[PDB]
Design an enzyme around this catalytic site. Structure first.
Site, PDB file in Angstrom:
ATOM      1  N   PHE A 181      -7.982   6.209  -5.331  1.00 17.30           N
ATOM      2  CA  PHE A 181      -8.281   5.462  -4.111  1.00 17.30           C
ATOM      3  C   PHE A 181      -7.191   5.659  -3.052  1.00 17.30           C
ATOM      4  O   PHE A 181      -7.473   5.853  -1.862  1.00 17.30           O
ATOM      5  CB  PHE A 181      -8.412   3.973  -4.452  1.00 17.30           C
ATOM      6  CG  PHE A 181      -7.172   3.382  -5.067  1.00 17.30           C
ATOM      7  CD1 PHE A 181      -6.100   2.979  -4.269  1.00 17.30           C
ATOM      8  CD2 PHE A 181      -7.063   3.251  -6.450  1.00 17.30           C
ATOM      9  CE1 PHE A 181      -4.937   2.455  -4.840  1.00 17.30           C
ATOM     10  CE2 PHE A 181      -5.908   2.731  -7.030  1.00 17.30           C
ATOM     11  CZ  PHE A 181      -4.843   2.332  -6.225  1.00 17.30           C
ATOM     12  N   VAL A 190      -1.332   1.007  -3.580  1.00 17.62           N
ATOM     13  CA  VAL A 190      -1.260  -0.434  -3.423  1.00 17.62           C
ATOM     14  C   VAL A 190       0.182  -0.729  -3.010  1.00 17.62           C
ATOM     15  O   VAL A 190       1.140  -0.121  -3.528  1.00 17.62           O
ATOM     16  CB  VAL A 190      -1.626  -1.188  -4.730  1.00 17.62           C
ATOM     17  CG1 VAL A 190      -1.371  -2.693  -4.584  1.00 17.62           C
ATOM     18  CG2 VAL A 190      -3.098  -0.935  -5.072  1.00 17.62           C
ATOM     19  N   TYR A 237      -0.361 -11.678  -3.447  1.00 21.64           N
ATOM     20  CA  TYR A 237       0.581 -10.845  -4.149  1.00 21.64           C
ATOM     21  C   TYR A 237       0.871 -11.291  -5.569  1.00 21.64           C
ATOM     22  O   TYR A 237       1.127 -12.464  -5.826  1.00 21.64           O
ATOM     23  CB  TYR A 237       1.881 -10.793  -3.349  1.00 21.64           C
ATOM     24  CG  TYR A 237       3.005 -10.033  -4.022  1.00 21.64           C
ATOM     25  CD1 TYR A 237       2.964  -8.643  -4.165  1.00 21.64           C
ATOM     26  CD2 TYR A 237       4.107 -10.719  -4.520  1.00 21.64           C
ATOM     27  CE1 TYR A 237       4.022  -7.950  -4.808  1.00 21.64           C
ATOM     28  CE2 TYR A 237       5.153 -10.047  -5.153  1.00 21.64           C
ATOM     29  CZ  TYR A 237       5.108  -8.675  -5.294  1.00 21.64           C
ATOM     30  OH  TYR A 237       6.176  -8.059  -5.917  1.00 21.64           O
ATOM     31  N   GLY A 277      -3.506   5.308  -7.180  1.00 19.42           N
ATOM     32  CA  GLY A 277      -4.571   5.916  -7.952  1.00 19.42           C
ATOM     33  C   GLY A 277      -5.363   6.836  -7.043  1.00 19.42           C
ATOM     34  O   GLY A 277      -4.907   7.188  -5.947  1.00 19.42           O
ATOM     35  N   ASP A 287     -12.801  -2.401 -16.769  1.00 17.26           N
ATOM     36  CA  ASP A 287     -11.511  -1.712 -16.858  1.00 17.26           C
ATOM     37  C   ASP A 287     -10.437  -2.710 -17.188  1.00 17.26           C
ATOM     38  O   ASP A 287      -9.368  -2.724 -16.582  1.00 17.26           O
ATOM     39  CB  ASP A 287     -11.181  -0.943 -15.564  1.00 17.26           C
ATOM     40  CG  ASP A 287     -10.135   0.182 -15.782  1.00 17.26           C
ATOM     41  OD1 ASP A 287      -9.787   0.483 -16.964  1.00 17.26           O
ATOM     42  OD2 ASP A 287      -9.678   0.769 -14.765  1.00 17.26           O
TER      43      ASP A 287
END
Ligand SMILES: [Ca+2]
EC number: 2.7.11.1
Length: 309
Positions: free
Chosen positions: A28, A31, A96, A26, A140
């Site tokens: 940011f 990931v 995870y 994203g 969100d």
């Protein structure tokens, strides 16, 4: 180096983790799936760079999220494991989760079974009630931010838009899932953690129908339509009444008629007894489906089996 000395571990992440494989991204940054060399354990790492354009705001985003993540201690919120810092890149490490509810929808190209929607909804709801009890708001909630982890737990993820205090008044969230009161704030108003109850209601439809209502119109129009129009509902009459009522309760347009997440924890949909292996089985059947995908090496959903490679 104030916040640095306070919020970060001193180690060099590069010596701690390996086999990094991107599993999402994203604004940011990205990931990653990764392996903690110390205990041969898999972790997720969210790398957030703060040099790209202007360090300023990116750095502020990092600190706020780290501070937010440090506070969470609930089994239905993603477990935070600490953060490291190297070359203008903050590494936020977390347990995870092999897939989001959204990945599940993408792998089977079908809505989830109702008992599965109930199990997913219940877990996310518990996390929201916990956040709400501490006066935070997620803001969100969507299938993409509801994560599954083995052996079989549902966890809320992506706290990048979260508020540490209610009432709040910022325009934030993802259009299709945003509550009317948040959109109304577009002028100047305020809202509760009840907005998450609304977003959860939309997510329930997304899990039952693969997409949130309005997904077929552009973001701006959807915004106008969420505010000024009636509330959507599940379209099939085949779902049980409990589910139907659960969703219509979440989607009451006026906050005052909408129940709190705590009240929903007692809703019949969520309390109806279900097999104890629902999530586990949902994950197993998903892993099995991914293994059969054609040209797997080139299918993005192969990430679900990263821990096996
Ligand atoms: Ca504010």
């Amino acid at each position: 180096d104030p916040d640095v000395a306070e919020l970060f571990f001193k180690d060099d992440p590069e010596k701690l983790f390996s086999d990094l494989r991107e599993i999402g991204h994203g604004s940011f940054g990205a990931v990653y799936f990764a392996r903690d060399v110390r205990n041969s354990e898999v972790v997720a790492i969210k790398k957030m760079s703060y040099s790209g354009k202007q360090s300023n705001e990116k750095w502020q985003d990092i600190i706020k999220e780290v501070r937010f993540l440090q506070k969470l201690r609930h089994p239905n919120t993603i477990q935070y494991r600490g953060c490291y810092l190297r070359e203008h890149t903050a590494w936020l490490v977390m347990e995870y989760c092999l897939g989001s509810a959204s990945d599940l929808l993408e792998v089977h190209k079908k809505p989830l079974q109702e008992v599965e929607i109930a199990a997913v909804t219940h877990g996310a709801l518990q996390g929201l009630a916990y956040l709400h009890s501490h006066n935070m708001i997620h803001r969100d909630v969507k299938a993409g931010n509801i994560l599954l982890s083995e052996p079989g737990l549902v966890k809320l993820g992506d706290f990048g838009s979260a508020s540490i205090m209610a009432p709040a008044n910022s325009f934030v969230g993802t259009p299709y899932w945003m509550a009317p009161e948040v959109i109304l704030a577009m002028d100047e108003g305020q809202y509760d953690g009840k907005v998450d109850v609304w977003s959860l209601g939309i997510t329930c439809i997304e899990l039952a129908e693969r997409k949130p209502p309005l997904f077929n119109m552009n973001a701006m129009s959807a915004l106008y339509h969420i505010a000024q129009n009636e509330s959507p509902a599940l379209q099939s009459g085949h779902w049980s009444e409990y589910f139907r009522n659960f969703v219509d309760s979440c989607l009451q347009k006026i906050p005052q008629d909408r129940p709190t997440s705590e009240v929903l924890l007692k809703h019949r949909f969520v309390l109806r007894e279900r097999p104890p292996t629902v999530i586990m089985d949902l994950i197993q059947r998903t892993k099995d489906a991914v293994r059969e995908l054609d040209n797997l090496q080139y299918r993005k959903m192969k990430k679900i089996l990263f821990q096996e490679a």
